[PDB]
């Protein structure tokens, strides 16, 4: 069952991805534990940055020998990549693998390279320029400032986001590893808020970087790396609620939830996304993101039913909207909305969600008999 | 809303009680608290001892001055009695108020007396025989043993019940209080299990007591006092689940749950009752108790729906039964049933129950539209 499911799900994610000219494949590996690992390949839309669907989940337990995880892990990725392309196919070309590599950078790249896959990878540590004999940060820091830029870096805790000023620098770079030369992007916070550790990124990518415009697209894309964590979060919640409230179905159901933490991710997005957009001037987008139907995330049954269920409720929420829907589902989950945010939590969502799910059993039950 | 509800509910309890020749009104006052009081009048069937419905709920908070509760409380009862008879009416005659009085015995009795209400009251402490100038236990203990008898006294903790041997003694007795003379029943355990505190009851009642047969009916009826605690328990659970998981609706909803902890009480009974019966030889009863439909506790919607929902499930459970139903609802709540008891807990019940409730929203939702 488990894997076969995935394939199915995946399939869905792929078919959905064709309807778009360019997309980003965000990926990370995580520690999901009970009271083993999961590398996930999440895909967004490269224009509205709206989540499209989860492309793949690499599951594996803890590398038995102590320090043998870093190897067991470092190949799970490959496996995935390997299986992403397999799934995606030729769309692959429309995909910019976004991520962070703490290790085996080399690999990833050679791997990405042989296949001529697009990407952006932020290099977590210090590597070396084999043609400058100079450190990345170094070589790169010696380049002439390409120009300034301000992005919106997230902030966690409770929480709005913090706008950060950036000083970019572009460059080509050859790693030691296998004499792999490629373009780097160096971004340093300018006047970082008080006490806040100054931002500083060193991205390597397939993508152009000659001009400030070119380097932004990179800095930007990257900036959209954090999305996967959310997925992760929305998941571990709707999960650690079912494993906080409930066999053989343990590694199974999660695989489900994964595809269920998506729709929620896409229900919250219906609202947040738009907001984000504006803040960056992009109106058309937001305008399209927010202007989504429900049919996008929902199901007629889930649509009709969630309709009756949530009757004397919408205000700003356009009728038949994803936005609406999200909201309904929030309420059903208990969206009081004190602080006036319109930003329901994962719990409420999962609630109203699972809830929207029960009543369904009803409706569906009737409907069936209603015939037979 | 709150009280008006009760009245409604009550009404139901009354109308249901007419269909029976004799009934017992069990009553107790309880401490329901959050993280004030409730005297409840629960009614059973005096022949199968199957719960009929809750007759009344006396609600009141803590008597502000310290030791002023015992007075505030001691009149809440009256209030109830007063309001039970009001509700019941002439059926009153078919009712044997069963209970335990730690205080104001006198009152209760005078009260019961003036109205010519039937009853059995166990006198928790030592009062005095004003015509024997001898203590109850005393006077009574001087009487000749009327004969032996074995009943089934419950056992708590985790738990089957403990059969206890009894040595009865009958008698008339006049209290000091208002020169109130009435019949007493003295029951003492014979060879009580090891370490177990020996049983010993001193009941006062309207009922006959001359012959062993007459005294049993009393000892028996009484023995059916514990039922109210269950109600209480089934309630505080399905409650402290909704107050463990969730305003203005706090004192309201409970009043509901009260009428909802009944049906569950009646769903468990569908099984337990029968068992109890047999153990006491009474077959016809059990045979009728267990032979109940669902329509008794359920609703067509809840019946049909709980039907689909629980399809590939029954075995011993006769089709269309309360028993069935109970079981279904248990499962829906998660009745694994390891120890092989067929004795689901209050939690499972409340679960599958509340659950049976969600899906309903479905079904009912469809059904409505299905038309409109």
User: What's chain A look like in SS3?
Assistant: CHHHHHHHHHHHHHHHHCCCCCEEEEEEEEECCCCCEEEEEEEEECCCCCEEEEEEEEEECCCCCHHHHHHHHCCHHHHHHHHHHHHHHHHHHHEEEEEEECCCHHHHHHHHHHHCCEEEEEECCCCECCCCCCEHHHHHHCCCCCEEEEEEECCCCCCCCEEEEEEECEEEEECCCCCCEEEEEEEEECCCCCCCCCCEEEEEECCCCCCHHHHHHHHHHHHCCCHHHHHHHHHHHHHCCCCCCCCCCHHHHHHHHHHHHHHHHHHHHHHHHHHHHHHCCCHHHHHHHCCCECCCCCCHHHHHHHHHHCCCCCCCCCCCEHHHHHHHHHHHHCCCCCCCCCCCCHHHHHHHHHHHHHHHHHHHHHHHHCCC
Nearest to A364 among B358, B362, B369 (CB): B362
Q: Is B338 on the interface with A (CB under 8 A)?
A: no
First to last CA, chain A: 29
Q: What is the 3-state secondary structure (H, E, C) of B67-110?
A: HHHHHHHCCHHHHHHHHHHHHHHHHHHHEEEEEEECCCHHHHHH
> Using an 8 Å Cβ cutoff, are B98 and B26 in contact?
yes
Looking at the complex, does the CB of residue B364 fall below 8 Å from at least one CB of chain A? Answer: yes
Q: Do B359 and A365 touch (CB under 8 A)?
A: yes
**Chain B, nearest residue to A310 by Cα:** B365
For A369, the closest of B308, B355, B365 (CB atoms) is B308
Q: Which of A301, A306, A366, A367 to probe the B interface (max B CBs under 10 A)?
A: A366
Residue A158's Cβ-count burial label (10 Å; 0-12, 13-18, 19+) is exposed
B305 touches chain A (CB under 8 A): yes
Question: 3-class SS at B307?
Answer: helix
B-chain residues near A309 (CB < 8 A): 361, 365
Is A283 an interface residue toward B (CB < 8 Å)? no
Residue numbers after which chain A is interrupted (C to N above 2.5 A) read 35, 158, 246
Provide the CATH number for the domain around residue A329: 1.10.740.10
From the list B304, B309, B366, which residue is nearest A363 (CB)? B366
**Interface check B303 vs A, CB under 8 A:** no
Of A355, A362, A369, nearest to B365 by CB-CB distance is: A362
* Same domain, residue pair B207 and B342: no
Same-domain pairing of B202 and B279: no
Query: For residue A207, what is the domain's CATH number?
Result: 3.90.350.10
Task: For residue A332, give the chain B residue with the closest CA.
Answer: B358
Q: Are A359 and B359 a contacting pair at CB < 8 A?
A: yes
What 3-state DSSP class applies to B247? coil
Chain B within 8 Å of A301 (Cβ-Cβ)?
no
A345: closest CA of chain B, how far (Å): 17
Domain end call among A197, A216, A246: A246
Within this chain, do residues A257 and A356 fall inside the same structural domain, yes or no? yes
The answer to whether residue A360 neighbours chain B at the CB level (below 8 Å) is: yes
Are both B135 and B201 inside the same structural domain?
Answer: yes
Q: Write the Ramachandran bin of A120: left for phi over 0, alpha for psi from -120 to 50, otherwise beta.
A: beta
Distances (CA, A) of B160 to A18, A59, A104, B357: 65, 47, 64, 31
Mutate which: A244, A300, A351, A361, vs B, most B CBs within 10 A: A361
DSSP label of B344: -
Give A97-103 contacts, CB < 8 A, sequence gap 24+.
A97/A24, A97/A25, A97/A27, A97/A121, A98/A24, A98/A25, A98/A26, A98/A27, A98/A221, A98/A222, A98/A224, A98/A225, A99/A26, A99/A27, A99/A28, A99/A225, A100/A28, A100/A124, A100/A225, A103/A70, A103/A74
Q: Are B74 and B262 in contact (CB under 8 A)?
A: no
**DSSP line for B139-208:** HHHTSPP-EEEEEEE--------EEEEEEE-EEEEE-STTS-EEEEEEEEESSPPSSSPPPEEEEEESS-
Q: What is the largest distance, in Å, between two alpha-carbon atoms of chain B?
A: 77
CB pairs under 8 A between A and B: 64
Task: Choose one of A246, A266, A297: the last residue of a domain.
Answer: A246
Q: Are B305 and A360 a contacting pair at CB < 8 A?
A: no
Cβ-based contacts of A249 with chain B (< 8 Å): none
Q: What does the alpha-carbon distance between residue A207 and residue A182 come to, in Å, rounded to a whole number?
A: 9
Nearest residue to B190 (alpha-carbon basis) of B162, B170, B213, B227 = B162
Query: Which of B308, B365, B370 shows the shortest C-beta gap to A305?
Result: B365
Specify the DSSP class assigned to residue B210: S
Beta carbons of B280 and B261 less than 8 angstroms apart: no
Q: Note whether A43 and A27 are within 8 A (CB).
A: no
A254 in the same domain as A234: no
> What is the count of structural domains for chain A?
2
Q: Which of A322, A353, A50, A17 is CA-nearest to residue A9? A: A17
Q: Given A358, A367, A370, which is nearest B358 (Cβ)? A: A358
Interchain CB contact of A4 with B (< 8 Å): no
Would you say A342 and A327 are in contact if contact means Cβ atoms under 8 Å apart? Answer: yes
- Please state, as a whole number, how many other Cβ atoms lie within 10 Å of the Cβ of residue B351: 21
CB atoms within 10 A of CB A19: 9
In whole angstroms, how large is the CA radius of gyration of chain A? Answer: 22
* Domain region containing B230: 1-246
| CA–CA min distance A308, chain B (Å) | 7
Q: Is residue B83 located within the same domain as residue B230?
A: yes
A213, with CB counted inside 10 A (0-12, 13-18, 19+), is: exposed
Q: Is there a single domain that holds both residue B8 and residue B100?
A: yes
Q: Quick check: A27 and A98 in contact, CB under 8 A?
A: yes
User: Is residue A336 within 8 angstroms of chain B, CB to CB?
Assistant: no
Is B305 close to A358, i.e. CB distance below 8 A?
no
Residues A46 and A194 in one domain: yes
A chain contacts of residue B351, beta-carbon cutoff 8 Å: none
Please state, in angstroms and rounded to a whole number, the distance separating the CA atoms of residues B204 and B186. 9
Q: Are residues A6 and A77 in the same domain?
A: yes
Measured in angstroms, the resolution is 2.9
Contacts of A308 in chain B (CB under 8 A): 365, 368-369
Q: Residue B362: its chain A contacts at CB < 8 A?
A: 305, 358-366
Which string of b and e fits A301-339 if b means at least 16 CB within 10 Å? ebbebbbbbbeeebeebeebbbbbbbbbbbbbbbbeeee
Inter-chain residue contact A368 with B309, CB threshold 8 Å: no
Measured between beta carbons, the chain A residues lying within 8 angstroms of B305 are 362, 365-366
Cβ-based contacts of A356 with chain B (< 8 Å): none
For an interface test with B, the pick among A362, A368, A371, A372 (most B C-beta atoms closer than 10 Å) comes out as A362
> Is there a single domain that holds both residue A176 and residue A287?
no
Residues B195 and B328 both lie in one domain: no
Shared domain for A141 and A222, answered yes or no, is yes
CA distance to partner chain B, nearest, from residue A366 (Å): 5
Q: Give the span between the Cα atoms of B363 and B300, in whole angstroms.
A: 12
Strands A118-123 and A95-101: parallel
Decide if B365 touches A, using CB distance below 8 A. yes
Q: Which of A196, A220, A246 is the last residue of a domain?
A: A246
């Amino acid at each position: 069952s488990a894997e076969a499911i995935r394939k199915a799900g995946a399939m869905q994610t792929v078919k959905l991805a064709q309807e778009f000219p360019e997309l980003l494949a965000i990926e990370d590996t995580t520690s999901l534990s009970y009271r083993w690992w999961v590398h996930s390949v999440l895909l967004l839309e490269a224009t509205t940055f709206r989540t499209v669907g989860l492309l793949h989940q690499e599951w594996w337990m803890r590398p038995d020998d102590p320090a043998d995880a870093d190897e067991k892990e470092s190949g799970k990725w490959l496996a995935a990549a390997a299986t992403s392309r397999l799934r995606m196919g030729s769309m692959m070309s429309n995909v910019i693998a976004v991520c962070d590599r703490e290790a085996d950078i080399h690999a990833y790249l050679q791997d990405k390279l042989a296949h001529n896959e697009r990407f952006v990878v932020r290099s977590k540590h210090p590597r070396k320029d084999v043609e400058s004999g100079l450190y990345l940060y170094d070589h790169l820091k010696n380049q002439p400032e390409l120009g300034g830029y301000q992005i919106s870096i997230p902030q966690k805790g409770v929480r709005p986001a913090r706008k950060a000023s950036l000083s970019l620098r572009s460059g080509r770079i050859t790693l030691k590893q296998g004499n792999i030369t490629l373009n780097a992007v160096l971004a340093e916070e300018i006047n970082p808020p008080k006490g806040e550790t100054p931002l500083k990124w060193l991205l390597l990518t397939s993508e152009p970087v000659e001009s400030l415009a070119q380097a932004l697209r990179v800095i930007d894309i990257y900036t959209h790396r954090w999305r996967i964590e959310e997925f992760h979060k929305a998941w571990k919640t709707g999960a650690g609620a079912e494993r906080q409230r409930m066999p053989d179905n343990l590694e199974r159901m999660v695989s489900i939830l994964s595809f269920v933490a998506v729709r929620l991710l896409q229900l919250r997005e219906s609202f947040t996304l738009p907001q984000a957009l504006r803040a960056q001037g992009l109106l058309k987008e937001a305008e399209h993101v927010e202007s989504q139907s429900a049919e996008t995330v929902l199901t007629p049954d889930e649509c009709q039913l969630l309709g009756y269920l949530d009757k004397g409720k919408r205000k700003r929420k356009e009728k038949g909207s994803l936005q609406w829907a999200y909201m309904a589902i929030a309420r059903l989950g208990g969206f009081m909305d004190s602080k006036r945010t319109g930003i329901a939590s994962w719990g409420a969502l999962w609630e109203g969600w699972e809830a929207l799910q029960s009543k369904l059993d009803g409706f569906l039950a009737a409907k069936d008999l209603m015939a037979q």
